[PDB]
C-alpha cells in the first residue's frame, strides 16, 4: 500500500513503434493498421528546420524517398499525405499487432504516459501531464520525435500526444495524433516563449488525498474554507481556480478519506502560506500535480 | 533534453504474466519457458499466513490444486516443486512469448522496473531502488505478490525481484526469482523491523551530475575536499560511506561534465549540511538517491 508516479504498460504500444527515414533524418512513427504517422519535419533538411515551407517540401517527395522500418523488416509506402504537422504514409501491410485504438485530444491536467522511443526502438516510459500552457516536462533527447502518449482503458488505447519539439525552458511540446499542436507552437527553430506554469489545483488536492490514504496526515488541520475564499489564496499562488466541476471530480476521493473537498482545500491554503517546514508528504518536499483524481483511484484500487 | 524517472519498457514482461490460483487464495505468476514462478504462500489459507509451516502444507498439495490462467485459457499442471520462498509449477505448454531471460541476485543501490500486477494482468510500470536495508518504496495492494522486478539490456530481461510482503513501516519485501528473501526477511504475518535506511550515496552524486548536464547548476561551489573526509560527514548524515569503487563508476559522468568526482562531493557536502535554502535541483527540492550512475548515462544516451 504505497504510492509511487505509476506508468501504464507499454507493450500494447511498442508493437506500433517503426523507424521512419527520410533523406538523412530519421525519426520515430505510430504503425497502426496500413497507416504510419511521424512529426512531418523528417522532411526537413538540418538547414531548413529555420524557416520550413512545409508545402513546398512535400511536393518535392515521392513515395520512395520514405524508408519505414519495423525492426529488421522494411515497409513499402505507397500514399503520403499531411494532416497539420503529422504526416500519414500508406503502407502496403497492416500493422498484425494493432490494437484497439483511438485519437484523443487530452485538456490541461490531465496525465498520459510516455513511451520515448530512439530509431524505432523503446528506451523506456514515464509519467506526463498536459500542462496548463500547453507544454510538458519530458526527457527528450535527437530521434524521440514521434514517440508518442497514451492512456490505456481495460483493452483500448487512447493516443493523444506526439512529440515533436523542444522549448527554450526545457519543456517539450507536440501536437495530438491529428498533427493539431497544443498550445501556440509550430514546428520551427526558434525561440517559443510558453506561457506561464500554473499548477493543477485539483491534481494537488487528489495527491493529497492519496497521502491520506496512505499514512501521511501531518498536514490536516482544524480549519475550513469556502471555495471563493480558497480560490483567492489560490490565484496569489499562482494555482488553477477551482471550479466546482473539479469538487465534484475529488468527490469519490471525499467519499474514502471523510474529508470534505472544502476541508482539504481549507490544508492546502495553510501549507501554501506556512510551507512544508522541512517535512515532507509522501516521500516528497513540493506537492505535487500531476496526479489525477483518476490516478490516484486506479492506484489505489488495482484497475487493470 | 530533460530528467525523469524512466521506467524499462514492459512489453517484453507482460508476455509471462499468468495468474496463479490456489483454493481461494489467487496471486501472480511468471511463466517462462514451461515452467511457472509464484510466491510459495499461495498454499496459505488467509488463517495459515501468521504462522505458516510450509513444508505440511505442500505435501497436501497435488498438481490439480493449482490452476494456472495464461488471459482466459488456463495451463495444466504437471509437476510443482519448491525452492525456498517461491513456487515452481512445471506445465505441459512452453510459453510461445518466452524472452531471452536472467535470474540475477542484484545489490543495494541497484535500480529495476516493476511490472504491478493484478489478477495476472499488468496495471502498471514504475522505476524502483533497492534500498541498503533490502526493502523497496514501492507501491502494492492485495493480490499484487508475484509481480516481479526486471532490467532489459538490449535483448535479454534480467529478472531480479518478485513481490512477496508489506512491512511495517510502509516500505516492501521480496526475494530474488529463486526464492530467496532480499535481506532477513521471511513469508510470516509478522511485526518484522526493517534496518536503518541509510541514502544510497553514489546514486545522489549521479543524480546531481545529471542535473548539470540538464542546466541545473546552482548547487556546484567552490570548494573541494577529499575521500575521507567528506566521508566522516556522510555518516552523520546517514549516507553510505563513498569507496574508490564508487568514484570510478561515476568516472564516466566526471569525464562528461568536467566537474571532478571529489568536487562534487564537495558540493554535496555543503549541500547537506546547509540545505536547499527553498531551492530545488531537477524538479525536486530532496536530495535524490534513485538513480544509479548507469540509470543517468543510458537516459542521456538514449539506450534502447
Ligand atoms: C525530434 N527528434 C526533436 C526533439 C527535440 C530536440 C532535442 N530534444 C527535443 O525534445 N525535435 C526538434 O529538434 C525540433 C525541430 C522542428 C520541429 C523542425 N526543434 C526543437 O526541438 C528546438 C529546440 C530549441 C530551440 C531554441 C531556440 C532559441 C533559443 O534561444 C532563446 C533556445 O533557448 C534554449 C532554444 C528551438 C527548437
Ligand atoms: C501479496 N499478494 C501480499 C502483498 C502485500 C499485502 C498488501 N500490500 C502488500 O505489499 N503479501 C502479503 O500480504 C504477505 C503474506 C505472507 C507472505 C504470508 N504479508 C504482508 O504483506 C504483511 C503486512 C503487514 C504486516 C504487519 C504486522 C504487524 C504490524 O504491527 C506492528 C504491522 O504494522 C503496520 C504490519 C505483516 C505482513
Same mark, same amino acid.
Given at each position: ?15 506500433? +513503434? ?5 533523406? %538523412?533524418?530519421?525519426?520515430? @512513427?505510430?504503425? =497502426?493498421?496500413?497507416?504510419? /504517422?511521424? $512529426? ?121 500526444? +506526439? ?5 527554450? %525552458?526545457?519543456?517539450?511540446? @507536440?501536437?495530438? =495524433?491529428?498533427?493539431?499542436? /497544443?498550445? $501556440? ?120
Amino acid at each position: 500500500s504505497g504510492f509511487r508516479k505509476m506508468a501504464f504498460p507499454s507493450g500494447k504500444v511498442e508493437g506500433c +513503434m517503426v523507424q521512419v527515414t527520410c533523406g %538523412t533524418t530519421t525519426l520515430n @512513427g505510430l504503425w =497502426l493498421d496500413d497507416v504510419v /504517422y511521424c $512529426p512531418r519535419h523528417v522532411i526537413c533538411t538540418s538547414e531548413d528546420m529555420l524557416n520550413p515551407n512545409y508545402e513546398d517540401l512535400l511536393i518535392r517527395k515521392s513515395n520512395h524517398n520514405f524508408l519505414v522500418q519495423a525492426g529488421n523488416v522494411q515497409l513499402r509506402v505507397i500514399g503520403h499525405s499531411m494532416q497539420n504537422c503529422v504526416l500519414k504514409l500508406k503502407v502496403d501491410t497492416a500493422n498484425p499487432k494493432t490494437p484497439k485504438y483511438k485519437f484523443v485530444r487530452i485538456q490541461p491536467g490531465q496525465t498520459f504516459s510516455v513511451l520515448a522511443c530512439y530509431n524505432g526502438s523503446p528506451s523506456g516510459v514515464y509519467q506526463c501531464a498536459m500542462r496548463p500552457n500547453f507544454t510538458i516536462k519530458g526527457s527528450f533527447l535527437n530521434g524521440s520525435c514521434g514517440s508518442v502518449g497514451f492512456n490505456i482503458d481495460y483493452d483500448c488505447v487512447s493516443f493523444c500526444y +506526439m512529440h515533436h519539439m523542444e522549448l527554450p %525552458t526545457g519543456v517539450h511540446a @507536440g501536437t495530438d =495524433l491529428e498533427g493539431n499542436f /497544443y498550445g $501556440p507552437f509550430v514546428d520551427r527553430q526558434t525561440a517559443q516563449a510558453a506561457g506561464t506554469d500554473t499548477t493543477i489545483t485539483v491534481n494537488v488536492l487528489a495527491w493529497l488525498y492519496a497521502a491520506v490514504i496512505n499514512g501521511d496526515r501531518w498536514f490536516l488541520n482544524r480549519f475550513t474554507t469556502t471555495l471563493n475564499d480558497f480560490n483567492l489564496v489560490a490565484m496569489k499562488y499562482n494555482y488553477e481556480p477551482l471550479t466546482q466541476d473539479h469538487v465534484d471530480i475529488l468527490g469519490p476521493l471525499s467519499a474514502q478519506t471523510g474529508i470534505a473537498v472544502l476541508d482539504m482545500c481549507a490544508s492546502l491554503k495553510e501549507l501554501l502560506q506556512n510551507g512544508m517546514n522541512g517535512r515532507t508528504i509522501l516521500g516528497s518536499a513540493l506537492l505535487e500535480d500531476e496526479f489525477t483524481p483518476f490516478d490516484v483511484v486506479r492506484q489505489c484500487s488495482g484497475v487493470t
